[PDB]
Amino acid sequence: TQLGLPGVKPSNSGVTGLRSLGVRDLTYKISFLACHVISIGDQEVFLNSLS
Amino acid sequence: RVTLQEAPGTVPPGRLPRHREVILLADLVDVSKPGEEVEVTGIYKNNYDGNLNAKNGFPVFATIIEANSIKRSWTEEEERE
Amino acid sequence: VVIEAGALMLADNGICCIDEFDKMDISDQVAIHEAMEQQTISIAKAGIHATLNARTSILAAANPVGGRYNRKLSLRGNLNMTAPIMSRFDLF
Amino acid sequence: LPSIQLPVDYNNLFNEITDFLVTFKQGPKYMAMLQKVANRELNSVIIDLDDILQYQNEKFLQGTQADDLVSAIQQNANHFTELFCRAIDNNMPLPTKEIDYKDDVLDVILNQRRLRNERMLSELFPPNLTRRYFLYFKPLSQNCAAISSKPLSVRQIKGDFLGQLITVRGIITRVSDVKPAVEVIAYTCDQCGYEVFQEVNSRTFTPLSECTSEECSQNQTKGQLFMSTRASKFSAFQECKIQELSQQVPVGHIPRSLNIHVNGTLVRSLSPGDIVDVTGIFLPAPYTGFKALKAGLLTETYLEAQFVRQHKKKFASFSLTSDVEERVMELITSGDVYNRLAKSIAPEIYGNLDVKKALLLLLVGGVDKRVGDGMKIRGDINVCLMGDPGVAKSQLLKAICKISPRGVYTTGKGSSGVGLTAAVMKDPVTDEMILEGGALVLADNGICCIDEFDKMDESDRTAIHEVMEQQTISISKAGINTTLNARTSILAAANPLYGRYNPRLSPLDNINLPAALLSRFDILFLMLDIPSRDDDEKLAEHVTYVHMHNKQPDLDFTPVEPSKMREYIAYAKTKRPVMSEAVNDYVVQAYIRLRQDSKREMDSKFSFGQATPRTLLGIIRLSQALAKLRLADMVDIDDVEEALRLVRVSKESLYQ
Amino acid sequence: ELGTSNLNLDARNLLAYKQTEDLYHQLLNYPQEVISIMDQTIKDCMVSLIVDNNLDYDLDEIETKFYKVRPYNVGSCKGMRELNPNDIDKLINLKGLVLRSTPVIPDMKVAFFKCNVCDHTMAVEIDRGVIQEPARCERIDCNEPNSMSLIHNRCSFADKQVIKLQETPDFVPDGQTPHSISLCVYDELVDSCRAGDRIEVTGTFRSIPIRANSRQRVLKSLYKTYVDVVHVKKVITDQDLAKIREVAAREDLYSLLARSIAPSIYELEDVKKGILLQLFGGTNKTFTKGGRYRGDINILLCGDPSTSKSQILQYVHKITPRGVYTSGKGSSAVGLTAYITLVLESGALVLSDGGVCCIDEFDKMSDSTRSVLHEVMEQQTISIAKAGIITTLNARSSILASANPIGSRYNPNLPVTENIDLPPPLLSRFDLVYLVLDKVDEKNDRELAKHLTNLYLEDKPEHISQDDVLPVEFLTMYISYAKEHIHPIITEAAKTELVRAYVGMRKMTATTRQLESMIRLAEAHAKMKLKNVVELEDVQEAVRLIRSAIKDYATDPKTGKIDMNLV
Amino acid sequence: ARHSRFGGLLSIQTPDKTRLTVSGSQALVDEKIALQKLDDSKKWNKRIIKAAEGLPNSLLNSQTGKAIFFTESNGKHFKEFINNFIDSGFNILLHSVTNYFTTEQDRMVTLEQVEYLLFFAWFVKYQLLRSKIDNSADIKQVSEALKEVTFILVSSLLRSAYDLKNWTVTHAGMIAFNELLNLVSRTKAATDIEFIVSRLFSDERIQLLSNLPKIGSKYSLQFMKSCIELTHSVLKVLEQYSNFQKVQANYMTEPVIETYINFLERFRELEDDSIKKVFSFFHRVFVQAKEQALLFRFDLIILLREMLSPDGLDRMSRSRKYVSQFSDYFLARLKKRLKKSPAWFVGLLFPPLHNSEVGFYQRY
DNA sequence: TTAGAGAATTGGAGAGTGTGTTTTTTTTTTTTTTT
DNA sequence: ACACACTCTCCAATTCTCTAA
Ligand SMILES: Nc1ncnc2c1ncn2[C@@H]1O[C@H](COP(=O)(O)OP(=O)(O)NP(=O)(O)O)[C@@H](O)[C@H]1O
Ligand SMILES: Nc1ncnc2c1ncn2[C@@H]1O[C@H](COP(=O)(O)OP(=O)(O)NP(=O)(O)O)[C@@H](O)[C@H]1O
Ligand SMILES: [Mg+2]
Ligand SMILES: [Mg+2]
């Protein structure tokens, strides 16, 4: 929101002085960018599944 | 505009149902009523939305379905029977 | 509404455990009764409507009234549970 | 654009001010204060308008005309804070004592800046930056008196008063915690190594961002400015709210309130629940920026505090100046203070002398105790009145409510156990949970009066159990888990079961209180209405006289007035008299007899329950209160036997 | 040699050495500069040691690390309400209790730029919160304006966290409620402290402006204030081990420890003993399957008024490292366990985890509120299932309860279970139940009267009930060490006695819980002697204390009433 | 160590009691950093001046410290192709294409000139490198380059390009003429070749080859680098001719030294080898020729601090051996000069002074 | 070889213009009327 | 009307080139 997003207005202290911000203030959030998921919680198909 | 939801018989066990929204134009308005089970043919289409981008923080587009068609007496033989 | 799933939804095709059932409010026992009757859950509020499947088996525990069972009395006399709910357990 | 004439010239008044500061005396009065300011011993100057009035009268009696500066600074008070400050700065004397000047950052900065200018040459800064003091006006004494001396209720403060100096009477509703406010801000320029200042008056400001100094500009040095705390000037700020007394609200209306601001050494003077005479300057609050352009002509307003007068001196505020010493010596030299003070409580009520003596000991109270391992024992005394209808119980109870400097009155039917103790309210619009103390917290370090104690619900009365013995409150509710302090003594009144006392039953049947609560009162007094042609005649003659004259009938006895009574009690609550072995043996032996007699008679019509260990400590507390009233530092056996008599007399009403 | 980066320093040592007597004052008046000076001194000294003593350690490793001083014990503590605008940027010391902590916030420290056309890159230093972005790309042949750009995920960051500290009740003004202040904490100290902790801190008292709106540089005249902590403290030697082992060899140990938890309280020896065993606790057990078994003991004190029950709860509340004191009319079901606010929040039994929860006026709270305790006492867990939140939390919490009987004074014409009046599912969950009675006796009364009156012979008493008691500090050390290092096991002999004793109480009512509570009490007794095995003596003491607590010997075995003459 | 908002403030006092202000926690302890940080705030930079167009990317206008990348099969197949080309085709190709262009030089176009000069260069260098490596290879394979007609033609291209101020052909011709000289020193390290040298070093050509570094100061970083490497070779041949004192004095003057420093200060971009070449030349100017007065000029003294600091040249690269061994001697001789005649303190800022009566004593 | 007279290219000072701003639950403590 | 973002314009500072002593 504090960057130049087309069609939307701006919205513990951040960082400032960057060109695109002008006099505004910028903060950040932490998140995880995953690449795969694995879960850990017909009789013929079942039998083929077993060793 | 009409909101369309997965029929409960189709939804897999232990999952919530999904939703989509459909746009109806000139000849198709009021073809269906709330609570009906309905079948739809149309174009699948997308557009930019500022609020989605602002809330999610990624260049994420929104999607919609534009309907082209929508779907859901007796003879003399029956009367004689 | 927040819609987000409750306990009976997570226990679909599973076992749902209720401990100290007799302490549950009547206003909520009836909700469990309505779900158990149909294996189905219904939502209708704030312009949002939804129907969900709840194929869940229930396992419950309870206290006899007064803390100790009375051999002079029926299980209905001993247990603080309404007759329609009692009618729907396969085994006691 | 246009201009007018007015009757006041400020040059003349400035000359009057500078003469007054250097000439007036009751050396001159204010020069001693300015010497203390110069020595860094004193932080604030309080100007008395009684002095200015006296000065005007003396100058007039010497046969010369003078301007009425007193009305002039009441009519337009804001401007004269600046005039007096400039006069003080002009006339300030040099220090009498060494100071350790190098402790001041501003001194070093300004000395170096002056040296830079001196080298360069081979107003500088705003004067507010070096005013080490605060200044306030104190209103005219009404006994000399003018509007500033006459209190206004919060309804009478019309729009006419904006700008003037006034006095307001009411109750404080809430108080903010202290935070700093800027007055002069300081900056540093990186490239040219030069400092600049900015002064702030409005609620908001824009900080500087370019070095506009002429030398820096002529070197084409477009350097960057940075803010600094270490050479900025702050002042302490606090905001409060005052509201009109409930007994002055006209019928069908909702009470009104005012916003109070406080700066300087006057901070943290006010407290919630105080009844007070605040005096100050009443001003508007202008809008700023784009908001002003579309706010319209309706102005917000507030009161700048200058001085505060409390109605009743709290016991913690006592100190023995010789003015008070001279008055307590009257009572001490006159003698027999116990009887005179007891007789002086509510003189318009006939008889009841032992009840009044018990209530005097309630006002004094025992000694707080704290053992070396961390155990602590209650010092407060709890009292209860149990009796027939129409024997002045509510009247006597409400009379003691006037003497105590902190106290509250409450009735059993109008009260919730929550609101009596403390409540967890979801009060703000933001869904936040906040704790707000009840009546027993507002009565902290005071007396709490509970009338109609027998009408209060059995469940709600249990809330009082913790406060009575442990003097604290414990809460564990949604989002809140804390303990509050409640150092309060309880006084309560009730009718027996079925109303008028029934002699067919035992005292315990009539009393109808549970054992755990009946034990928490140190004294329970039983008073019965039994007819007698002789006593009824005397009471009627006394009451009829009072209705005829508005005065108690007197031939021999003069009561002490409530003010001198408060001074004596406040002095007496400082003594902490200790016990001794000779006294300890006597009370130890008395206690055994009480429990043996109780055991013998638990079956009997004359029973009152069983004597617990809390009855021993009751004797010690009553004995120590008696020792305090005679200003001793040692409990005497003379006190113990009186403390036992006063407990024995409570039961004699049962024997007609 | 331990590979560690932070050095503690109590400031009084600066006054002892003559050359630093003035540096002590300069530290308090100019913390930001002085602390930095100290840091760069320590690092240089560490380098000097390895190069002068010519040791094998990697010089590059030491050059890479950051070293920080952490000063403490600076001076007198300051009341939270009495900080004034003349204290700004000076060092401060505060005492208080921790309410809550926000999650870790990333704080930027170095910015990373890349040229859009020629792919030149620059790392830039952040100071005073402002990014010093270059005007033009610095590569000689690509000297172009607006040509550099920031790359967020190649910057470098650091951890910041905010802690909410509340005023301790010792300082609050008369007739008022406590206030709170916010602490900013960085790097090492980030996750140190939990809700309900009690601490003392040291840090610079700071103030800053705040903006009127997010669009413009307009500031408000009032300034925000906070504390910037540099150290946190909670409110071993062979000599300690020697003292502990020597004390454990005394013959009168069990009585010595018991009479020393609450020195000024007269007699009530069995009550003190039971409370001591609650402090030690049993052993915690977990299986591969078949669950986990609680080590904690629950106690109920029931009886006549004035008997000094609540006074005992004060001592336990101050002795325990973690715990809570509360009242029956003061507690709701939510407040006692956990609160929805969308976020979840902790109640008393959760804050008290691993400690003792003292509940007074237990007979005043309703059946609705008391029903919450069944699950927490039996399982030591709290299950929740409400809108948007469903989970289970751990509660290893010991309950100490106080109540008065029905009718408010013990009635000898009713059986004991009817006087106590708790329902059986809840009364079955206490390990020990005590009856205490206000029985008249001249022998007892003279001693009690002499004891209480002796406290008033002095202004601040030195007098104490007994000649030999242990100081609170050492007693705390003993209990803490024994909890950490000692883990008793059942011996076969103890197994035989427990089976025999249970069959004795059972054959005649004793439930199956009487067996488990006996095991737990015997284990607690074994720890208190620093033994690794439960023996016959421990089992017999556990049995004896259970029989003594509920006045069983004086109980009519058939009618359930107590003969008051036998007390 | 501590975060970006912890920072205090610093004041620094000069002689004459004037004070400056700088922020940040490292400035408290490091004066070198404080002094550098103080000047770094200041806004201005002087704006700056700038040679080649019309032709496809090549060595002439790109930084060639950037390879292109081969499969193993490709590496060996490419090596086989050009190795067989050299052993088979090179002399017969060059002999034909050169005896064409002598008859057609007037009609040429810029591209054909830049092709010829960058085909010559590549193949001669690659063969020298290959026989440096191994004895199976020999130098006879490239020996058509030396015979007299081609030598004249490379000379003539360089001549004509220089006169008309066509700087791209001049650049390529510089590269070709470098290699011919390199090949000559190879063959002398083994008759007609000395004749070819004597004709290559007629006085006219020494005027040209002396002239060439002086103009390099303005142009791109490659041009100056070509000038340096050619100069190194040109002097080294004439060293092993044994005239020499006439020729070396021809090279030593202010506008050559200007080019050398202007090139040397971009050392972050350059090779380990080129700096060896520059300091070889300074050893020649300073120690051997004993023309010390050229290098007492301030922007050299700045440079040696940057490059020698913990900032720049690595603590263990071979460059620091040469640089520190140079600077030690530099400052010793500078000390001696300054104490003998204190006027050089004001000398060190400015160019030397060309007046007859004072200038002779100034330079010595 | 220096230097001075004339022409061309570039920077940014600073002046101008247009613009945006005020402003149905769900969970939990407490009072009140209703069966 | 009050801080900002962006556009437009003119003027002089600068370097380059030619000529003669
Ligand atoms: N000794 C007395 N002297 C003077 N007035 C008295 C006396 N005894 C009773 N009265 C009068 O009795 C009236 C009622 O007093 P009040 O305090 O309301 O009684 P009470 O004890 O509170 N009765 P109740 O509230 O019904 O239990 C007052 O007007 C008193 O003036
Ligand atoms: N054995 C004792 N030792 C010390 N003080 C005692 C003893 N017995 C009684 N007391 C005193 O008597 C009072 C008992 O108060 P308290 O602790 O509230 O007792 P309690 O059992 O909680 N009674 P209650 O609150 O009415 O149920 C305190 O002042 C104690 O100091
Ligand atoms: Mg009354
Ligand atoms: Mg108690």
Ligand SMILES: [Zn+2]
């Ligand atoms: Zn400046």
Ligand SMILES: [Zn+2]
């Ligand atoms: Zn670039």
